[PDB]
Amino acid sequence: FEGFYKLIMRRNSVYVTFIIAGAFFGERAVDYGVHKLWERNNVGKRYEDISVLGQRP
Amino acid sequence: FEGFYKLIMRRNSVYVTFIIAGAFFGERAVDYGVHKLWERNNVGKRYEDISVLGQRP
Amino acid sequence: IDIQAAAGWGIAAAAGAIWVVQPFGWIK
Amino acid sequence: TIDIQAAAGWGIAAAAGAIWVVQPFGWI
Amino acid sequence: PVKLKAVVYALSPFQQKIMTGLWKDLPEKIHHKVSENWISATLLVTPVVGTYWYAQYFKEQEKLEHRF
Amino acid sequence: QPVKLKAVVYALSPFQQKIMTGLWKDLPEKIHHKVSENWISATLLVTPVVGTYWYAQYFKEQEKLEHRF
Amino acid sequence: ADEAEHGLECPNYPWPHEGILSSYDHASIRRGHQVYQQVCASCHSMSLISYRDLVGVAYTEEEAKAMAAEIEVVDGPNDEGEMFTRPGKLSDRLPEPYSNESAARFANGGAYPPDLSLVTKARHNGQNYVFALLTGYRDPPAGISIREGLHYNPYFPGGAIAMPKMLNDEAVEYEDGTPATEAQMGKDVVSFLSWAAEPEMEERKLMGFKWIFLLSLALLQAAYYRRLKWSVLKSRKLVLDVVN
Amino acid sequence: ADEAEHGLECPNYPWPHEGILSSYDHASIRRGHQVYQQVCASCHSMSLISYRDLVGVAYTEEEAKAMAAEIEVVDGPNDEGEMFTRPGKLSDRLPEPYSNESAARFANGGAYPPDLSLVTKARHNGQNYVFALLTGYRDPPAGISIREGLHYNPYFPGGAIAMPKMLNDEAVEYEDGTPATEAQMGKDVVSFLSWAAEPEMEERKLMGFKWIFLLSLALLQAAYYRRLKWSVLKSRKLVLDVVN
Numbered sequence: 001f002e003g004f005y006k007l008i009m010r011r012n013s014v015y016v017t018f019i020i021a022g023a024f025f026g027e028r029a030v031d032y033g034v035h036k037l038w039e040r041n042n043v044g045k046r047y048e049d050i051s052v053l054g055q056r057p
Numbered sequence: 058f059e060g061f062y063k064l065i066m067r068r069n070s071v072y073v074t075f076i077i078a079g080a081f082f083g084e085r086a087v088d089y090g091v092h093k094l095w096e097r098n099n100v101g102k103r104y105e106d107i108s109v110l111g112q113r114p
Numbered sequence: 115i116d117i118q119a120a121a122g123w124g125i126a127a128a129a130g131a132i133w134v135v136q137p138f139g140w141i142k
Numbered sequence: 143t144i145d146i147q148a149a150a151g152w153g154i155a156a157a158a159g160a161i162w163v164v165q166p167f168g169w170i
Numbered sequence: 171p172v173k174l175k176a177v178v179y180a181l182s183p184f185q186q187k188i189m190t191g192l193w194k195d196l197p198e199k200i201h202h203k204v205s206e207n208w209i210s211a212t213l214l215v216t217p218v219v220g221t222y223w224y225a226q227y228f229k230e231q232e233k234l235e236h237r238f
Numbered sequence: 239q240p241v242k243l244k245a246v247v248y249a250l251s252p253f254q255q256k257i258m259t260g261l262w263k264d265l266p267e268k269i270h271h272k273v274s275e276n277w278i279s280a281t282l283l284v285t286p287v288v289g290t291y292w293y294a295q296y297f298k299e300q301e302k303l304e305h306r307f
Numbered sequence: 308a309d310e311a312e313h314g315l316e317c318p319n320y321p322w323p324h325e326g327i328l329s330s331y332d333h334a335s336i337r338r339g340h341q342v343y344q345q346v347c348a349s350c351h352s353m354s355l356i357s358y359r360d361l362v363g364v365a366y367t368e369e370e371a372k373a374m375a376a377e378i379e380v381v382d383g384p385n386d387e388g389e390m391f392t393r394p395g396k397l398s399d400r401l402p403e404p405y406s407n408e409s410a411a412r413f414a415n416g417g418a419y420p421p422d423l424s425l426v427t428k429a430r431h432n433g434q435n436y437v438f439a440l441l442t443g444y445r446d447p448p449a450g451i452s453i454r455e456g457l458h459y460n461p462y463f464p465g466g467a468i469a470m471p472k473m474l475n476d477e478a479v480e481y482e483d484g485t486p487a488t489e490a491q492m493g494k495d496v497v498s499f500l501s502w503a504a505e506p507e508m509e510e511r512k513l514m515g516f517k518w519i520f521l522l523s524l525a526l527l528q529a530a531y532y533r534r535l536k537w538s539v540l541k542s543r544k545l546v547l548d549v550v551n
Numbered sequence: 552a553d554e555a556e557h558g559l560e561c562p563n564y565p566w567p568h569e570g571i572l573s574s575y576d577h578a579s580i581r582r583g584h585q586v587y588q589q590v591c592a593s594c595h596s597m598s599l600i601s602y603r604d605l606v607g608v609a610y611t612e613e614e615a616k617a618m619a620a621e622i623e624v625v626d627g628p629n630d631e632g633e634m635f636t637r638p639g640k641l642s643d644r645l646p647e648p649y650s651n652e653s654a655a656r657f658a659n660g661g662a663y664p665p666d667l668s669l670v671t672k673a674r675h676n677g678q679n680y681v682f683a684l685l686t687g688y689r690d691p692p693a694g695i696s697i698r699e700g701l702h703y704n705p706y707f708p709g710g711a712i713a714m715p716k717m718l719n720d721e722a723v724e725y726e727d728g729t730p731a732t733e734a735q736m737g738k739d740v741v742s743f744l745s746w747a748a749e750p751e752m753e754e755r756k757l758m759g760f761k762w763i764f765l766l767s768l769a770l771l772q773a774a775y776y777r778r779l780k781w782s783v784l785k786s787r788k789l790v791l792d793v794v795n
């Protein structure tokens with residue numbers, strides 16, 4: 001990991017920015033993955049899958 | 058006279074009781090004296106000085 | 115010096131209780 | 143001449159954190 | 171700690187009069203208070219009083235001018 | 239009061255050692271050590287709770303049957 | 308220009324309750340409440356005042372009980388879930404003349420008669436202002452015209468008030484026989500309004516005189532205690548070697 | 552007596568919204584709501600639910616807009632000061648069948664049809680109890696008599712409920728053509744009642760899976776950090792002079 005060390009860990013300002021980006025992108029990726037699992041486990045149960053949606057007299 | 062007097066300046070327990078008693082009697086006397094002067098300065102303006110007190114119709 | 119002080123401080127405590135709480139009428 | 147680079151490096155971190163706490167993607 | 175060389179004589183509080191010093195040398199006390207602070211009192215009172223009277227003078231003239 | 243001491247201590251850098259492998263090492267003996275030393279303590283804690291709980295369910299079951307016509 | 312928008316200043320009147328050792332005139336409060344019942348209460352509400360408040364101040368318990376029982380208070384629901392009316396009790400508040408603010412404005416030309424519970428405290432120089440406003444209905448100065456539905460009153464800001472002159476001679480019959488002149492009724496109702504805004508004044512004033520006197524005595528002791536402790540320092544003689 | 556006092560225990564049903572990654576069946580929520588507004592709403596209130604709450608859950612915005620417009624909501628007072636009536640809006644709460652609690656008891660033989668906004672959270676085993684109660688109307692056991700006006704339900708504590716049986720076959724007509732059997736309506740209505748008690752559940756469950764997973768990674772890193780800082784202490788060699 002010394003190649004990555006020489007680029008990110010050398011300065012604490014860069015290391016702090018790396019942590020900020022990792023929290024930003026990492027949380028977005030986990031959020032996307034959780035939503036994919038949520039959709040796959042609940043097929044046909046969402047509000048968008050109501051057959052008579054928009055057809056109330 | 059001398060019996061209470063010598064106990065007051067010699068024992069703090071007696072002196073504390075003397076302070077408590079003075080606060081009790083001193084405040085009551087002031088409260089009585091203030092009310093007497095209040096009554097003297099407001100003759101005829103009291104609730105029980107109303108002439109028609111007791112005959113609404 | 116121990117019994118007399120205990121009696122004196124108990125008397126002050128009782129006087130303080132009668133002074134803070136006024137049980138006039140409860141003395142029946 | 144490294145205090146200036148320290149300021150620029152920390153300025154990027156402050157900018158990166160600001161876009162991270164407040165995420166104004168719907169405003170830009 | 172500061173090294174100090176001094177001799178101090180003190181008298182018991184119960185061997186001296188406690189309150190009569192309040193009204194001793196009263197003319198000197200008043201003269202010292204007035205003579206040392208008359209410039210200070212002037213610098214505080216004059217701008218406040220002068221500004222206050224000018225505003226009342228301004229209001230009186232403005233009020234009279236709008237009358238018929 | 240500070241303590242006067244005579245010892246020699248040798249220590250190694252944290253970056254020269256494996257950090258996590260020691261948790262899963264001699265696992266069976268940790269399970270042996272935990273069970274063999276603490277089995278009396280676990281008995282004195284679990285037995286009164288289970289014994290009292292079982293007795294209450296036994297009491298309520300016989301009582302419920304006694305009130306049935 | 309701006310002389311009218313503030314309105315005419317009110318003079319200072321020697322109210323019987325003014326002074327550090329002065330109480331309310333309880334006979335005047337009872338008369339003032341009668342003025343409220345027959346004149347003010349038609350369009351003014353007193354929602355912070357209840358009939359039990361008058362007991363021991365202007366009426367006895369039985370007098371206030373009978374007075375409350377003469378009104379109808381909305382109560383319920385009953386066991387069937389329907390609202391009903393019942394005679395009032397001591398704990399009931401003074402009745403409201405209108406169902407809501409909108410009903411009050413519609414019945415008064417769009418102006419809302421304010422609640423009079425705290426009116427003497429809710430205006431500058433409240434006791435004097437209310438008396439001057441009540442007895443200050445007069446013809447407008449030359450060059451001033453008043454629109455239809457309003458009345459001129461210099462004490463009211465702007466000079467145009469939506470309330471008519473309500474305090475006319477003999478408008479109320481007093482049970483004590485005092486002549487019910489405009490000034491007598493005006494003085495009495497302000498006295499009643501003053502008590503309603505500050506029902507604790509007599510207790511507050513009595514506490515003030517006693518405790519300011521006691522604290523002044525403690526201040527004399529506090530000065531003596533400070534000077535006694537500091538006397539050993541203030542009378543000290545310090546001998547040093549320095550000269551300049 | 553002994554066992555009737557607590558009632559018969561409800562079973563455990565496999566609800567579609569049970570599970571760490573399971574959502575509500577939004578088609579069953581819409582079906583359950585139609586049951587409520589056609590059967591339950593005549594005697595039960597849902598005072599915590601608004602028409603805007605159903606938007607994005609079971610109805611479109613215009614579907615709920617039209618729904619609210621069908622009801623008459625008290626409003627006012629107007630400029631003249633009278634309470635009037637207006638069509639309902641999205642922000643309006645669901646209508647109350649009765650004007651107050653006493654009116655509800657009078658219409659139901661002294662029993663109050665409680666608010667159903669949190670009923671599945673206000674009972675032990677809420678979802679299962681409500682479904683079991685609705686579909687659990689049957690004959691009493693031998694030797695047990697019910698008073699007139701009371702109906703036997705073993706799941707109800709005491710066995711005597713003032714509720715009559717209302718989930719009769721074909722009591723409602725579904726928009727999607729689903730056969731409205733008693734068990735089907737009972738499952739839909741609990742699904743709608745479950746959502747009303749916990750409308751945030753879907754967001755809550757998504758948050759839980761996300762953050763419990765993320766914190767588990769932090770726990771693994773926390774152990775490495777602690778064991779890295781302590782390794783210099785735990786692997787150290789200590790030479791001392793004592794033996795015994």
Ligand code: HEM
Nearest residue numbers: 346347349350415418419420421426437467468469470473
């Ligand atoms: C003795 C009887 C009454 C007293 C003492 C009284 C007192 C007051 C007071 C203190 C004000 C407010 C003054 C201010 O805004 O600075 C007021 C306003 C008003 N009162 Fe009365 N009131 C009485 C009777 C009435 C009656 C009988 C009516 C109607 C028939 C009425 C209608 C109004 C209206 C409409 C206002 C609002 C005036 C405006 O906004 O310009 N009042 N009253």
Ligand code: HEM
Nearest residue numbers: 590591594595659662663664665670681712713714717740
């Ligand atoms: C599908 C329609 C309905 C559902 C799902 C429903 C739901 C419920 C629930 C959950 C309870 C609580 C039971 C308990 O407290 O243990 C209850 C009680 C009650 N319901 Fe409703 N309700 C419905 C319709 C009705 C109707 C139509 C009436 C009257 C005609 C009614 C009258 C009552 C009464 C009187 C009680 C209280 C009974 C008692 O406490 O003895 N309900 N209901």
